């Protein structure tokens, strides 16, 4: 997991002042969206993983307030458009964990540790991620437990337009 520090927010210092620290992280976050896979040092990767997850959350919101916050983070219009349209629909049902991190040894010159950061559901993914919604066996204790604790458990992906919206449109037309 990502370590928590004593500074406001618990973020890394990345050996930089706060002003340069924020400029660097915003640029890298923009490149992660564009390319979906980046190789860098362990500290910048750990900070980028936690920052990247919270940037996807804004895209899933799809609100005017969320877009204003993201417009101050992303550096390119094309990358910002992709975040709200393509990635928003991709992770509708996935609850967290949109980015993964795998260590890749040490560099050559300064022998610094490195890692790879990637998105967790796409073509070209390093591994195959678990389904966003976990299937539940019909005759398992798990099914009974979820009924008693969370009657609104989601077992299969839902359509883009739910039945209530479809029914309203049919009645209207």
């Amino acid at each position: 997991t990502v370590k928590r520090f004593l500074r406001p927010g618990g973020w890394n210092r990345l050996n930089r002042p706060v002003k340069e620290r924020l400029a660097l992280i915003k640029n890298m976050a923009t490149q992660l969206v564009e390319k979906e896979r980046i190789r860098t040092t362990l500290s910048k990767a750990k900070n980028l993983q936690r920052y990247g997850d919270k940037l996807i959350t804004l895209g899933k919101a799809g609100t005017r307030e969320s877009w204003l916050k993201a417009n101050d983070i992303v550096r390119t219009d094309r990358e910002l458009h992709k975040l709200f349209t393509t990635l928003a629909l991709r992770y509708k049902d996935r609850q967290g964990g949109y980015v993964r991190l795998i260590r890749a040894g040490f560099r050559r010159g300064d022998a610094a540790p490195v890692a790879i950061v990637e998105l967790v559901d796409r073509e070209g993914e390093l591994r195959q991620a678990r389904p966003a919604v976990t299937p539940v066996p019909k005759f398992s204790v798990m099914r009974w437990v979820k009924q008693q604790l969370d009657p609104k458990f989601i077992s299969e992906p839902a359509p883009l337009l739910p039945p209530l919206v479809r029914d309203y449109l049919k009645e209207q037309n």
């Binding site: 390093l126 591994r127 195959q128 991620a129 398992s140 798990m142």
Partner: protein
Amino acid sequence: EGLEHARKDAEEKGLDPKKLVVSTVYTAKGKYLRGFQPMGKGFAGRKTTRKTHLRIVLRENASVLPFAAQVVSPSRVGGASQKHLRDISVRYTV
């Protein structure tokens, strides 16, 4: 690089690579590149680049230490990783 070069030498002589032991290793002084670096108040110091020779000898059935290292597989990435097929329904039972 020296270890690989020495083993290739042993095979040409007709020795079994599976029984080789590192029996002798030592270093030797080379030719140095001399230089100077200025200091404060007009003083001067030395600035030397060093060089060394390396010698490795491999022999068969020589006295060897018992040290052995455990080996593990690296991270599984690609179609060979099947962590996504885990069934998590069992842990809800008693």
